[PDB]
Design a protein around this nucleic acid. Structure first.
Ligand SMILES: CCC[C@@H]1C[C@@H](C(=O)N[C@@H]([C@H]2O[C@H](SC)[C@H](O)[C@@H](O)[C@H]2O)[C@@H](C)O)N(C)C1
Ligand SMILES: [Mg+2]
Ligand SMILES: [Mg+2]
Ligand SMILES: [Mg+2]
Ligand SMILES: [Mg+2]
Ligand SMILES: [Mg+2]
Ligand SMILES: [Mg+2]
Ligand SMILES: [Mg+2]
Ligand SMILES: [Mg+2]
Ligand SMILES: [Mg+2]
Ligand SMILES: [Mg+2]
Ligand SMILES: [Mg+2]
Ligand SMILES: [Mg+2]
Ligand SMILES: [Mg+2]
Ligand SMILES: [Mg+2]
Ligand SMILES: [Mg+2]
Ligand SMILES: [Mg+2]
Ligand SMILES: [Mg+2]
Ligand SMILES: [Mg+2]
Ligand SMILES: [Mg+2]
Ligand SMILES: [Mg+2]
Ligand SMILES: [Mg+2]
Ligand SMILES: [Mg+2]
Ligand SMILES: [Mg+2]
Ligand SMILES: [Mg+2]
Ligand SMILES: [Mg+2]
Ligand SMILES: [Mg+2]
Ligand SMILES: [Zn+2]
Lengths: 206, 122, 53, 112, 122
RNA sequence: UUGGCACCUCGAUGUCGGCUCGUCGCAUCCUGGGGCUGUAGUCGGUCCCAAGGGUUGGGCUGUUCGCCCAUUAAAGCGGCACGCGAGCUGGGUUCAGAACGUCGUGAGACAGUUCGGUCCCUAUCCGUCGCGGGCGCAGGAAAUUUGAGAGGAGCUGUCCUUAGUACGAGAGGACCGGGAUGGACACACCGCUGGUGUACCAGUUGUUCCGCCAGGAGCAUCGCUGGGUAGCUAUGUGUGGCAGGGAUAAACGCUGAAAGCAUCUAAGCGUGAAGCCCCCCUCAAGAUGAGAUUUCCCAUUUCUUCGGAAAGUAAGAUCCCUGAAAGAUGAUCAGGUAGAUAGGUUUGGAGUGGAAGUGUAGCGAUACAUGGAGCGGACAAAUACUAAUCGAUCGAGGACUUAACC
């Protein structure tokens, strides 16, 4: 199981050798370093901690500087753990390049979905509108809060509230191209998040 | 992108001039039919002396739509109108002639007799 | 629609725990010697504490 | 995006001629019929050209057997053997959607 | 871009009014939201002024108000805001790339607590 | 269900059907497993286990119901104030008008019909969905996390092959296994196809204005019309429910006595469901049981008999300011000259479609050239020109006991 951290650059399309045209997400994954290895003896579980993008000194504090000094590297914007990896691979301070993947590798992409702010039940939960005419005064409303008997509302009556900005995993995206000199992965289809969003690419759990 | 109540020109030689879509086939709640899909339909306008008569409930394959079709190569095809061809339970047309162009998608769905009779297959 | 019970003094006072003003963000100027909002012009001197006008 | 431009640059077909909406073009389109690959000519007026770089598409309209047919292509698709501009049309706009509601004579584009 | 509690046409009128005021008076007091919109519009008028040619003068003329700034006296002819923008204001920013305005924060207005600012050329 | 009773409510517990939103039971409609069959096969019948998910769109009628059309794997039956009117509707019913049949001498009335007919309310509390502030968590901090526990998901068709094999006199026609491809549903995203796009580009009418012409501006739904960027989007695209594992239900067995036999059961072994627990996705240490790892700061001053107190600080954080990928506000995240955070500027790009001025041709409307021109919100990159100045505020000094090393 291999893993890397990249930024979503954007979407485009590529023609396959076949001739088919496929949509791709461009993930730029430069400056991934191995910062720490967690073992069962020390931490209670196997994981490798990867630091992604380089960050100006004045944006880092002394606690951060002390943690990346152990891996002889500069402060890092994003630090994430990968579990289910082989710790025998990964030396502390080693770069992690996008060539840990190959064209045809099936990956899971994890990121935070775009923020839509306060949203109603129609957009947030795909509920149906009431009629728009025939005397209706019920358009974009949540529906009955429930029956009478329990003198209260059950605990998953879906209602308006803040919509996106959740963690999302898309499973089984094909890697379409790996460009090491550009530190670029091309992934078939889309991954969560706005442009410039952290994307965690790891080998498909399935 | 044809649904219940969508009317369609009949692109063939059988009596039917205009059909009304009664049902998109192939799924419990299937909303929409595309090029190459078979619909159940009623004949709303007939040609006097034709084989297929007004009020007859028939099956028809959609052979061109305004909502066209995407192809794997990333190209699309769209027609100026929605037309269908009345068929038997074997995918053969009730008519002897097909009028107007017909989408290549028919050849893939195995409507070979229709593809052969069509003046152009785009 | 309407209050079922009047609100007690305690409950009213708890609700107002957060109904308050914050102190303004201010500090003494060097040239003036008197208080001013940060990132504002100081009227005592009559200009921006740093940039003369 | 400059990085997406660099990555896609290699897939830009340089054989693509200069054409505008209003031009009559002849698309030599590859067609995989049964097993053997075939060239089907599609000749019509360029109705629309939209997008940028590898994502740029154009649409060609023709009347086939008294039915308007529109064919939309990626500009840089390798499934177009050859695109030749047959005549240069005199038009006043980028999108000739008005042609969708005109039949013969009324739908004529003046040649330049 | 900011909607300043106004419809589209009201907002264009407001921007043209304030843009002209800043060109004519060179220093105005307004609300922070208005100033943050005015800097964009005034800096583009000064850019036109620096371009200097007839096409740019006519683009500015479509925006700037027909206001008299002063009456100068050779006969005494009036000077129009457009003339001030092309002859007085623009030429004094000939060696300055952009950043023709500055916003000084002032303090809240008594009647509505609106945060007021000075916006000035320089 | 039709009823019986009259116990709560007449200083009001809104009553049918529908819409929205569901949730529960299982007496199971489908899908899963199985026994018997008057089970050859394909289909079925009947019973047992099984509530995970699923369970259509129309015609008629206020309807519920029901019949019908066309589908579907299937079109389950019930409960929740015949669920849900401070959520909607208001067709029916149950008001004042009017009329018909009928009854009544009449006023009027109905085992009846008909046309028409005011649906109020700013949410206090609990509850539900989101989002902050406080304190806690025996020092103060910055990150990375474990997962007790919770939520989500859970559906299914057709075709090909196995095989025209098994089975059958034929007609017909499989299990099991392998593949492909759908429907419905969900999540993400805008490259594509489209939608929108009220500070983008163009055309155009009327009238007023800019002194006039030219060129522009105002108002007429953004005047109208044709396009359209970013953003937001579905009807668009990508992906998912894969494959498992453990223990079981009904059931099938093995060994096996009680009961020299027999017997799946008593001791003891196995098989065995879409179900249970995992696996998958998300939240999660206020998990007060307040967990773990890495890193940072250190043991200051004056008082307090005493315990402790207060007052400068460290690491760090905030106020304030520039903002957007974030957003009701807080919050979050990107920045604050240790500077590309925003605006401007310069160069691009999309988009529009050929500016103005000038010239040429034409009697002229206009055309052509200069010239893919000019314009160009929100997109890209560079650039410190403008503004993120200058300040201030908060924030440790680590209790006791015992054990183990020591
Ligand atoms: C078969 C019916 C049985 C009775 C119904 C109920 C009652 O009287 N409802 C009132 C209601 O009028 C309005 S709703 C228009 C009021 O808002 C509502 O609160 C309420 O009073 C009215 C409809 O008659 N009774 C308690 C029992
Ligand atoms: Mg947002
Ligand atoms: Mg609906
Ligand atoms: Mg309304
Ligand atoms: Mg209760
Ligand atoms: Mg207007
Ligand atoms: Mg009694
Ligand atoms: Mg009462
Ligand atoms: Mg049962
Ligand atoms: Mg009706
Ligand atoms: Mg009821
Ligand atoms: Mg009701
Ligand atoms: Mg109610
Ligand atoms: Mg009588
Ligand atoms: Mg009535
Ligand atoms: Mg309300
Ligand atoms: Mg309240
Ligand atoms: Mg709990
Ligand atoms: Mg799109
Ligand atoms: Mg678009
Ligand atoms: Mg006008
Ligand atoms: Mg004029
Ligand atoms: Mg007027
Ligand atoms: Mg035995
Ligand atoms: Mg087992
Ligand atoms: Mg299943
Ligand atoms: Mg930038
Ligand atoms: Zn001062």
């Amino acid at each position: 199981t291999k893993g890397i951290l990249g930024r979503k650059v954007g979407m485009t399309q590529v023609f396959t050798e076949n001739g088919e045209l496929i949509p791709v997400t461009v993930i730029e994954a430069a400056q991934n370093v191995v910062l720490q290895k967690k073992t069962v003896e020390t931490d209670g579980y196997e994981a490798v901690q990867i630091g992604f993008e380089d960050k100006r000194a004045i944006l880092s504090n002394k606690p951060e500087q002390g943690h990346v000094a152990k891996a002889n590297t500069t402060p890092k914007r994003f630090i994430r753990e990968f579990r289910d990896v082989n710790l025998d691979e990964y030396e502390i301070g080693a770069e992690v390049k996008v060539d840990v993947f190959a064209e045809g590798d099936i990956i899971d992409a994890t990121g935070v979905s775009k923020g839509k702010g306060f949203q109603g039940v129609i957009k947030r939960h795909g509920q149906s509108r009431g009629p728009m005419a025939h005397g209706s005064r019920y358009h974009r409303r949540p529906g009955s809060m429930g029956p009478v008997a329990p003198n209260r509302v059950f605990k998953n009556k879906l209602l308006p509230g803040r919509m996106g900005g959740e963690q999302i995993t898309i499973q089984n995206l094909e890697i379409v191209k790996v460009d090491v000199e550009k530190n670029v992965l091309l992934v078939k289809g889309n991954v969560p998040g706005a442009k410039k969003a952290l994307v965690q690419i790891k080998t498909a759990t399935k | 992108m044809i649904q219940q109540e969508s009317r369609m020109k009949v692109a063939d030689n059988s009596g039917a001039r205009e059909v009304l879509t009664i049902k998109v086939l192939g799924g419990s709640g299937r909303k929409t039919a595309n090029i190459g899909d078979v619909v159940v339909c009623t004949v709303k306008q007939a040609t006097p002396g034709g084989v297929v008569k007004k009020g007859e409930v028939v099956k028809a394959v959609i052979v061109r739509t305004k909502s066209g079709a995407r192809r794997q190569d990333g190209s699309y095809i769209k027609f100026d109108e929605n037309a269908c061809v009345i068929i038997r339970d074997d995918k053969s047309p009730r008519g002897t002639r097909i009028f107007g162009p017909v989408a290549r998608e028919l050849r893939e769905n195995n409507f070979m007799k229709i593809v052969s009779l069509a003046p152009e297959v785009l | 629609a309407v209050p079922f019970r009047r609100t007690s003094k305690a409950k009213k006072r708890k609700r107002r725990t957060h109904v308050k003003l914050q102190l303004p963000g201010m500090n003494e100027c060097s040239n003036c010697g008197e208080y001013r909002l940060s990132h504002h012009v100081c009227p005592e001197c009559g200009q921006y504490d740093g940039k003369d006008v | 995006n400059k990085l997406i431009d660099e990555i896609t640059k290699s897939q830009l077909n340089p054989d693509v001629p200069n054409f505008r909406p209003g031009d009559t073009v002849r698309v030599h389109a590859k067609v995989v019929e049964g097993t053997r690959e075939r060239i089907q000519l599609f000749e019509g007026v360029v109705i629309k050209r939209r997008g940028a770089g590898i994502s740029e598409t154009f649409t060609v309209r023709k009347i086939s057997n008294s039915v308007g047919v529109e064919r939309t292509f990626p500009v840089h698709t390798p499934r177009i053997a050859k695109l030749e501009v047959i005549r240069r049309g005199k038009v006043r706009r980028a999108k000739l959607y008005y042609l969708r509601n005109l039949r013969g004579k009324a739908a004529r584009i003046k040649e330049i | 871009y900011r909607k300043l509690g106004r419809t589209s046409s009201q907002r264009k009128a407001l921007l043209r009014d304030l843009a002209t005021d800043l060109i004519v008076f060179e220093r105005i007091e307004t609300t922070e939201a208005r100033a943050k919109e005015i800097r964009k519009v005034v800096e583009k008028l000064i850019t036109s002024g620096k371009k200097g040619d007839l096409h740019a003068r006519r683009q500015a003329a479509a925006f700037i108000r027909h206001e008299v700034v002063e009456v100068v006296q050779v006969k005494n002819r009036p000077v129009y805001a457009l003339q001030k923008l092309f002859d007085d204001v623009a030429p004094r920013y000939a060696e300055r790339q952009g950043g023709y305005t500055r916003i000084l924060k002032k303090g809240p207005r008594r009647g509505d607590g609106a945060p007021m600012v000075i916006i000035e050329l320089v």
